[PDB]
Amino acid sequence: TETTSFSITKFSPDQQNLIFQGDGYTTKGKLTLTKAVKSTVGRALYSTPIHIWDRDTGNVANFVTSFTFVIDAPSSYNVADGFTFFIAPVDTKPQTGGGYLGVFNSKEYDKTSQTVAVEFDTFYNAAWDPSNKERHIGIDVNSIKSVNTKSWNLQNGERANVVIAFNAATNVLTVTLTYPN
Amino acid sequence: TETTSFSITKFSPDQQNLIFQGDGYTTKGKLTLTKAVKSTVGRALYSTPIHIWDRDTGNVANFVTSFTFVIDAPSSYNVADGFTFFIAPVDTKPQTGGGYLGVFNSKEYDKTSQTVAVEFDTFYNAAWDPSNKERHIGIDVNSIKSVNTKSWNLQNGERANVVIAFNAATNVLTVTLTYPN
Amino acid sequence: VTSYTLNEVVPLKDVVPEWVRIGFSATTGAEFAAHEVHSWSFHSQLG
Amino acid sequence: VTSYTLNEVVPLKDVVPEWVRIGFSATTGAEFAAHEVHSWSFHSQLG
Ligand SMILES: OC[C@H]1O[C@@](CO)(O[C@H]2O[C@H](CO)[C@@H](O)[C@H](O)[C@H]2O)[C@@H](O)[C@@H]1O
Ligand SMILES: OC[C@H]1O[C@@](CO)(O[C@H]2O[C@H](CO)[C@@H](O)[C@H](O)[C@H]2O)[C@@H](O)[C@@H]1O
Ligand SMILES: [Ca+2]
Ligand SMILES: [Ca+2]
Ligand SMILES: [Mn+2]
Ligand SMILES: [Mn+2]
């Protein structure tokens, strides 16, 4: 058995246990992935590699993560591109920006990506996003085209509480987002 | 607030969350620091930097570690040099071997060492160990000459369970070693 | 309080390596917004 | 069951940096022994 567990309720100006990429940085007790500026990408990874499955026993880990995040857009009509919680290879670096969310480079399935991402997508990219054109939560596997999505109404500048859980017995990943109002 | 917890009840051959130095390696589910061989040093560090105190608030962390170790010597008369659990700067590399235990280089207090170590010393080094010549547990701060020691009777090849705890309200570090028999 | 839930079967073992790093990503493009995280906790048990 | 305990006041703040790494060390010299660790658990809480 191996268990890993951590909790951060206030970020330090020098979070040595985090790896920052692109424009990510901590300030005022928060982790800022992007400021409201054009064409930018910010990523923050926990520094320790996590043992997710074991090739010898074939066992896969059960895990649960919870975090609070906020999207603060100029108005409800100028908002992009979104945010993701992701699981990737240890050596992961930022991928394409814009609607690719800094995690994928194409809508075609790319097995060499080896990335699973839960997206909170705020902008409709006609080439792959769901046709209703609404903002949505989606589970992405090796592609920016989600395997499953759920419309979501963004509350601009409101703190969202998210819980993501993976049950190894069942192979089901579940996501839940909650606004207090 | 910030908390970190982990538990490894069996080491993997590719233990990516540990940094190995000197001769340390994982084998058959365990962590081998040294084999019964002359003049060698092995160290293993958890890879994640741990936030022990905060300069902003002056808060200091409370922590507890628990481990199981085995010393297996040729006989009860040929046994050296010892084993330690230590806390040091993130960039720590192996120091002097032999009676210095791979953590210090001197018996004179050296504040630039910034290392605290709990030693399980099995060999009497006349230059600094307690004069009773017995094997001992000791608390080391920036020097191989312990600030406090307790005689301990080594049980050759037996597993010892150790619990080390630091209480930040009191600044007291407590060590307890227990043998089944 | 308003909430939204989504689930999908993801065969992690066939997708990701044995060891991984977890993290957050956010981007902007011709349009934009500030993306911030205020707290984060995690847990996993293998075996 | 045989046990041994030892306590000492160590003002950590004045000795170690704010960020540290924790680990194990073992050495041999003219004399020797195999030193091995079988399991390890750790819990820390700041604030
Ligand atoms: O304003 C949206 C408009 O710009 C384009 C490129 O001309 O998309 C850019 O901006 C989008 C939102 O920020 C990003 O998703 C996209 O990746 C970026 O190229 C057009 O596609 C889009 O309609
Ligand atoms: O045999 C012990 C004897 O060897 C010396 C070296 O001449 O010490 C070496 O071995 C000791 C135990 O392994 C180490 O503590 C020591 O660091 C190493 O130099 C003599 O000091 C010692 O009496
Ligand atoms: Ca999109
Ligand atoms: Ca000694
Ligand atoms: Mn989408
Ligand atoms: Mn000693």
From Swiss-Prot, chains C, D:
The lineage of its organism: Eukaryota, Viridiplantae, Streptophyta, Embryophyta, Tracheophyta. The chain holds residues 218 to 264 of 275 of the full protein. This is Lectin alpha chain. It comes from the Eukaryota. D-glucose binds at residues 29-30. Transmembrane segments: none annotated. Coiled coil: none annotated. It comes from Lens culinaris.
